[PDB]
Amino acid sequence: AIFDNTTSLTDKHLDPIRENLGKHWKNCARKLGFTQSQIDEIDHDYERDGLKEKVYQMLQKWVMREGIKGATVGKLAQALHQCSRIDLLSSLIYVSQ
Ligand SMILES: *[C@@H]1O[C@H](CO)[C@@H](O)[C@H](O)[C@H]1NC(C)=O
Numbered sequence: 001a002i003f004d005n006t007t008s009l010t011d012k013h014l015d016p017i018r019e020n021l022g023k024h025w026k027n028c029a030r031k032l033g034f035t036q037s038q039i040d041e042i043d044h045d046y047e048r049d050g051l052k053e054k055v056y057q058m059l060q061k062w063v064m065r066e067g068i069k070g071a072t073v074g075k076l077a078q079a080l081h082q083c084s085r086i087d088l089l090s091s092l093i094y095v096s097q
C-alpha cells in the first residue's frame with residue numbers, strides 16, 4: 001500500500017512530480033510544510049528560471065529538509081492526497097513498484 005511505503009524518495013519517485021505538478025504548485029507546497037514566506041522566496045528567486053524550476057526547487061528543498069527518514073514514498077503520498085493531486089498520486093504508485 002502506497003501510504004505505508006517507507007522507501008526513501010530518489011529521482012525515480014520525484015521525476016513525475018517535477019514534470020507534472022505544474023502551475024498549481026503552491027497549494028502542494030503548503031501541504032509539504034512550506035510557509036507562505038518560503039513559497040514567496042521560491043516564487044521570486046526562481047522567476048527568471050521558470051515554473052519547472054520553482055517546482056524543482058520546492059521539491060528538492062522538501063527532500064533536503066525531511067532527509068532520508070522523512071522524505072519517503074508514503075509521506076509524499078499523503079501530501080499529494082492532502083493537496084488533492086490524485087493524478088500525481090497515481091504516477092507515484094506506478095513508479096514505486
Ligand atoms: C497557511 O495555509 C493557509 C491555507 O491552508 C493559508 O490561508 C495561510 O495564509 C498560510 N499561512 C502561512 C503563514 O503560510
